[PDB]
């Protein structure tokens, strides 16, 4: 495609395709500095994997969930988002409610394996 971050100024619909390109390259004064950045790299990465895990998205690149889109977050249509705004434009507009939706995905996953546990009781 375009490379690493190649579709940063592209529409959210075009950048959403081939997301495995920004998924690969995500993971003594010189020595201590270099080892300092090596440990931090694994920490920031595992935090994202920790989040994807407690959402049911562990292993997913595109992951649909149960939480409905509250129009208080953004009253924009799908067409005026994915075919117009860029991924950097979008999450500045959602920046406030981003911490609210992280909590919603976690309860929708703990109230999904708990309903799944009763399902396999029969």
């Amino acid at each position, epitope marked *: 495609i375009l490379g690493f971050l190649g579709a940063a100024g592209s529409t959210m619909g075009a950048a959403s395709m081939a997301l495995t390109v920004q998924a690969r390259l995500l993971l003594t004064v010189w020595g201590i500095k270099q080892l300092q950045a090596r440990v931090l790299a694994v920490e920031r990465y595992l935090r994202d994997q920790q989040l994807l895990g407690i959402w049911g998205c562990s292993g997913k690149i595109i992951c649909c969930t149960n939480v409905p889109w509250n129009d208080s977050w953004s009253n924009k249509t799908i*067409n005026e988002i994915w*075919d*117009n705004m860029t991924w950097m434009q979008w999450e500045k507009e959602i920046d406030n409610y981003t911490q609210h939706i992280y909590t919603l995905l976690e309860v929708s996953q703990i109230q999904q394996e708990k309903n799944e546990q009763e399902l396999l009781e029969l």
Partner: nanobody
Amino acid sequence: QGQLVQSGATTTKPGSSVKISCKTSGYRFNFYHINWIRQTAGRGPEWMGWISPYSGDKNLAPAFQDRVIMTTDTEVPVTSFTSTGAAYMEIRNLTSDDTGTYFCAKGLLRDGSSTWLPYLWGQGTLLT
């Protein structure tokens, strides 16, 4: 979400050629096409043609293909998503039939099937 101011009301006589400007602001000028529409006294509205400030690509109706001179500048960036550009409009064989109000119109989206649709209009310029 920006302004598309145009030139004044310049009135010449048939046979000549008139230049019309279209200065943009408040939006990424390269991300959206610039359409040109007119409403003459004799017909209704008539689509002339749009131009791509990014691809440099032009598409214009066959009724205005061998008359229209259509160009753009290159945007002067203000911020990360703001810029300032300009689109220009000229005509060849001018008559009093082409007398009417002319505006420029920025495109609707950046992808899909209604990309160029004239959404954000200018102000209007009265010809001869």
